[model samples]
Target: ADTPGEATPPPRKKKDIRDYNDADMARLLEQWEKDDDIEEGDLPEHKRPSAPIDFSKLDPGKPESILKMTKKGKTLMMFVTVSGNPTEKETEEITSLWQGSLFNANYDVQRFIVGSDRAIFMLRDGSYAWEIKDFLVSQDRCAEVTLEGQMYPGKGGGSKEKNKTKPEKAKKKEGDPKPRASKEDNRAGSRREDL
Candidate 1:
């Protein structure tokens, strides 16, 4: 029994651990605006702004060697690019944008590549070459056309006499086949440290 002037305790609240989807996120933000308040300097420096990843640290060339060292194992690479010479802030902004898109699509990768244009993004399944030529051309910037593979000779040669022969190029090299490292790989740090 409670004391005369003592009020009854409120029921214990339950904690929710469900994952949030895009729609849920939108709803959350919308609802948050209804009662959210920003106090003076509530957000901290590290929490406020974003930082660009240092791509130089992760050598793109290292992937092939690493794959070789793994003895025919699979390899994967994450690729990112900016339209122009991106400052650290710009890199951070673009990276954040990529993260949001990739997350919603549930795409993951292990290694990474960063470039200003014509980014060759290597993935676990295959490699993708993003042609920034359009963006460059729009800005009147001179750029190079990246060839995914070697060019082949066209059929029929003419030296007054036509030699009808179609040139065939070599097949594409096998891409990375090893298991890709994802966020889950980091969870069990000790066991998956090699990745």
Candidate 2:
């Protein structure tokens, strides 16, 4: 309906929607995308993944302890890929530096290799034996050294089966024995039934 003395409302503007061609649609999308620097320097520091913590202390706790134990050296019981010989050299140097220092009281040093430039230097306490089942010394190669007595606590096979057993069963194998038990175990077994 026309209003008296008022111009007829401009015909309702037709909706301008139209099917956009591929190039036009691409340009529209490019325009909508955020500029490269919108979030520059706005990230929270703690929100980023954190680096590993440094555990520089190796405290055995007791001052008068007869022996101390740590990962300073123990046999690497299996094959491991290293970046190069430099890694092996570094491993040897570090282990050698650890030997005979205050950290060496109850530990033994040994090295092993599945192949060249892939060597492991292990630090083991007199308390537990180490073993590697899948691979043992290959006598054919004189370089093969057996270190099944320092890295792990039990012989080759399932550790779960070994751990869940009677006291005597957990005892080291007949040929290779673990060092004598600590004072705690010694005190616990002090009493014997003399029938």
Candidate 3:
């Protein structure tokens, strides 16, 4: 079978399906399940540890504060204040612009709370503050802009002593009629809440 410039084909190997039996497969699945159930703390080198934040280091009054934090590789919460109250449409436009700008600048917006006169955004990178401020300043609807920085506590740890304490419910007056539940009282699972 040896021809002068042509190579011979290699022998084909047999398909050994018997190598993987039901018991072996079952044991592998069980091992995988056990691995999946392993907790994060069980790992020797856990990446995310509970780290305390220094509040004294942050300056909310300065726009550069966010940038400085980002340079130090810290994620932060920022409050964006605007002057006059913006309408629903205006709010949407502003939010859209803000998101686009942040995305272009290699930043990520984790969550945001939109109000009539202000908005608070939890950004993955703190450097987005100045870009957002500049964008808002260019918009005619936005009168003034301000940035405030905040720190988020690590997993299950923070200054949550106040949050742990629940506020006492006010006692109902004797003469007050029982309030009836209305559609406005509970709009559960409604999209209107986002607006």
Candidate 4:
């Protein structure tokens, strides 16, 4: 046997190249061949400048995810209406701005449902409403979006076009055993009180 100068075996099969159809992949095949990209109204979750949500403030029109997210934190409501009768894609992208972000990808999953040409944003951080608005116009697709760091119902429900109840709230304001009597008691008190 010759001098045992042992040569060690090197395992070099440890290369994990992730190529999902994302921004990373988009750029990789930026020129070669493009397939997976989010620019064309693809959905992602909102994360940055984001913090909270609210649940009690629910609207029948909105999706469960949106309502659920709102209930999850100290949510703020902001409205965004598109200028023209936009396509589904454009409308989606705008809402996506609130529900999520592209490019940098904050990775903080958000839930914001888009309506016909409008959306009620339930923000975590108040100022972020404006921050999101700023990001909205940058795309130039559905540019000039807005957010109103505000509330949803209560006042909204009261003055909601006076739709009233199903048959429409008329006659009286629901006379019940409920502690705070609004109509009858208020009227009686006001009339009898020495103002």
Candidate 5:
């Protein structure tokens, strides 16, 4: 009954980054911008819809790390649409509109990223992410607002699951790599080193 026949497989169009040679990076770099579809395909069964954060990994002494991971408010991420490459004057002209009631003074723009048909702006405030999406649509007509749809993590399929376990982590009990160890150590100390 150990027969492994009839198993299906995923296409290997997504090449590995570790596989990159020299010209491989040139090919992969061009391929990077065009693979969003493969990222949205049929995926594995979900154990939970909520995104997880491993609090165990964070140092208890520093709480500021959490803030570093996030930009505030709901999400003011906004996008603009253009026919071809947008010009500087054309880009800032759109920005000028954002500075009005559109900007609301208290609300600030975070950053601007330009592309061919989808130039983008991220506002410091996001309670307005939805509000500004429409604001841009009605105000400029060239802006592309984000969809209300949810986005998931990318590029997952065709990978094998649970083949074998390493005894190294027989599991983390009260423990835990790095600086050095003793059996092993000629110096005095290091971090996460033990048997």
Candidate 6:
């Protein structure tokens, strides 16, 4: 075929451009638009993109919600003392009774022993403090109730220490002069004397 090595013809180079027509591009564009329309139509109403949540529907800052939040950890302390120097068994019984009463009143409470005759109850809601105090006071065995921290006037007043062993009034010796006021008392304006 070479015929004794005559000059050889070089291989032709391939064309770079593909011969697509305007009609082809028009057809592809139409198909793409159709696909987008189909996708939009195929989605269910619920599955479609939604607007941001309407917070007004929640109705926040409600009393019940506030109480619930407080119940989680915000709590107040109540001190309970029994009358007649109660024994261990009596103390246990009183603790159990108070716990049951609190549970019945829909309150979450924790009890800790302060001494043989005294206990401290931690309550979720401050309002429940008075309720439990009143309940304990109603019992014949209970002598006194005190609350720790700040106190409200209309609620239950402040702490009081009452027991059967203490005398209501103490008689002072006729010869003994009245006790002198301390420096702290003077600062409080109870009794002031010039230096």
Task: Give the root-mean-square deviation of each candidate in angstroms.
Answer: 22.3, 32.3, 26.4, 24.6, 21.2, 41.0
lDDT of candidate 2 at residue 139, scale 0 to 100: 20
lDDT tens readout by residue for model 4, 1-195: 112224523322101111111111212222121133222312232222232232223233322222222222212223332322212332233333333221111111121122222222223233454446435433334312222233232111122222224322221233211223343333322111311
- Residue 155 in model 2: shift from native, Å? 27
TM value for model 1? 0.18
Candidate 3 regions off by >4 Å? 1-84, 95-105, 108-118, 121-191
The per-prediction tally of clashing pairs is 3, 9, 0, 11, 2, 0
Clashing pairs in 5: 177-192, 182-185
Number of the predicted model whose lDDT against the real structure is largest = 5
Per-residue alpha-carbon lDDT of candidate 1 for residues 1-195, written as tens digits (9 for 90 to 100): 212323523321101101111111212222222234311111122222212221222223322222111121112122322232212232223232332222112222222112332121222121121222123223322212111112211111111322222221110011122233222333323211212
State the displacement of the C-alpha of residue 41, model 6, in Å, after optimal TM-score superposition.
80
lDDT of each: 0.22, 0.24, 0.25, 0.25, 0.26, 0.25
lDDT of 1 at 15: 11
Question: Which of candidates 1 and 5 is the stronger one according to TM-score?
Answer: 5
Better of 4 and 5 by TM-score: 5
Pick by lDDT: 1 or 2, better one: 2
Tens-digit per-residue lDDT, 29-48, candidate 5: 32234344121212243222
Better of 4 and 5 by lDDT: 5
> Per-residue lDDT tens digits of candidate 2, residues 1-195?
211332423312111101100111211222122133121112233122211121213444322121222222323211222212222223323333232222223332223222232222233332231232112122221122222222322211112322233433233211111344332222322112101
Determine the backbone clash count of candidate 4: 11
Higher-scoring candidate on lDDT, 2 or 4 = 4
| Model 2, residue 45: C-alpha shift (Å) | 19
- Predicted structure 3, TM vs. truth: 0.20
Of candidates 4 and 1, the better by TM-score: 4
